[PDB]
Amino acid sequence: GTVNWSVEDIVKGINSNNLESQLQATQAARKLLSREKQPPIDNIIRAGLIPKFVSFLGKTDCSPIQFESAWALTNIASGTSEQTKAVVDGGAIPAFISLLASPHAHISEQAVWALGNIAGDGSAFRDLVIKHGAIDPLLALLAVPDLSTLACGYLRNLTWTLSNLCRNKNPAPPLDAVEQILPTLVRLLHHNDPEVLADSCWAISYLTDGPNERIEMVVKKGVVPQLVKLLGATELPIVTPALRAIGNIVTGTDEQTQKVIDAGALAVFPSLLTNPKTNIQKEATWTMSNITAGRQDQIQQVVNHGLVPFLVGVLSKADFKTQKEAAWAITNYTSGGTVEQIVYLVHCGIIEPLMNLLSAKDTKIIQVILDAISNIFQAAEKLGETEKLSIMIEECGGLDKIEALQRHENESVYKASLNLIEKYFS
């Protein structure tokens, strides 16, 4: 008698002066909003049920209706921004924060879930949730000696919701809120459950996405080693976010980058640069491009770990977007590397795969490659080996493309082309 009710029947019951009738009707509403597909979220909102639901949240005397309305509001909140807005507009945020203290673990978990959807909408609601004081109660829910004593699903929801409070960049979460949350985050990152680890990595992933001061407060917490370890996980849902975090960290100062190198992250790249999941391969190559954009001694670490042949590998064959990140990694390498290091790169066979990419329909990758060729010749010019390099580029159809790009349209291109042709060739 609470299965597949019509919205009007639900309205009929919730409007009666009978708490039990309202309870059945609320549960019926929750079931519509929980059905496999096409939950009537808009119809429920129009019927003006949100205010009734929000008010039921504050009924301590009847915990069951607190749960049902919490679940209904959770699913409405999981919709579009307009739908989530409807829930917030009803005054659900503070009502939910009060439920976090509930003696019924399943009710506060529902509250944790709803707050998760509200904060997940974006910067504005995220910061509004924080202003209503949700962080302390949430963290208090985790203030226990051993995370393993908490129910599996309850922990997964808390972590996920915390990762949403760390999410979004315009603007980034409040600095003081991040500091509050981090210590707990550092602890969840050492929990054995793969979902908890994934969402913890995602959170760190969001916090490291921004200015170097942001990256600093995370690195300062000493998590780089743990992130490197998770980088070698067998579960793709863990490797993906962990790699994104490590990648973000190396977009910062050289010293922040040295932290990932010291933690031994380079030893996992032979695998990542040939990973089956194209995305993991794209992210990894992009990460490499930022490391080769560092100090000569860091470029040298890339060399010692034998990662150059892997870059040659990616540049030679891979998804186009991955190849583009490879180009960058090369142009950066050649731009800050020593003469001896640029020579090594050539000995690894970079010239041919680099020349072949010039046939690509993408003015950006072409400027990047033409650029690298320049840097390479510049190094050869320092050894009187320019001719020898000309041959190689001439031997593998290289010149037959620079001369081509010489008739290109983009000013930056034909110029760079025209130059290389006269300064080292014809």
Partner: peptide, 21 residues
């Protein structure tokens, strides 16, 4: 400016919201 920050952020991003089935 050697370092290149994030683009489209495409490990995509975990679903921002979850419906309780």
């Amino acid at each position: 400016r050697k370092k290149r920050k994030t683009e489209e952020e495409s490990p995509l991003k975990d679903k921002a919201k979850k419906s309780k089935g």
